[PDB]
Structure formats: C-alpha cells, structure tokens
Amino acid sequence: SIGDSGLRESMSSQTYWP
C-alpha cells in the first residue's frame, strides 16, 4: 500500500506493506 519493504502487497502491483 504505502510501504517500501521487500514483501509486495499484491502479485501484480509493485508496492509493499510498511
């Protein structure tokens, strides 16, 4: 969502959980 970690939030997008 609004994180930059190394776990993507979803399979398609390129965003991460905080």
Indicate the pairing of strand 3-8 with strand 16-16: antiparallel
Cβ atoms of residues 3 and 18 within 8 Å: yes
Q: Taking the CA atoms of the chain, what radius of gyration do you get in angstroms? A: 6
Contact residues for 2 (Cβ-Cβ < 8 A; gap 6+): 15, 18
- Interior angle at CA 2, CA 14 and CA 5, nearest 5: 65
CA–CA separation, 14 and 18 (whole Å): 13
State both tokens at 9. Answer: 């939030």
Q: Cβ–Cβ contacts within 10 Å for residue 16, how many?
A: 15
Q: Which of 12, 15, 13 is nearest to 4 (CA)?
A: 15
Contact residues for 14 (Cβ-Cβ < 8 A; gap 6+): 8
State both tokens at 13. Answer: 């997008």
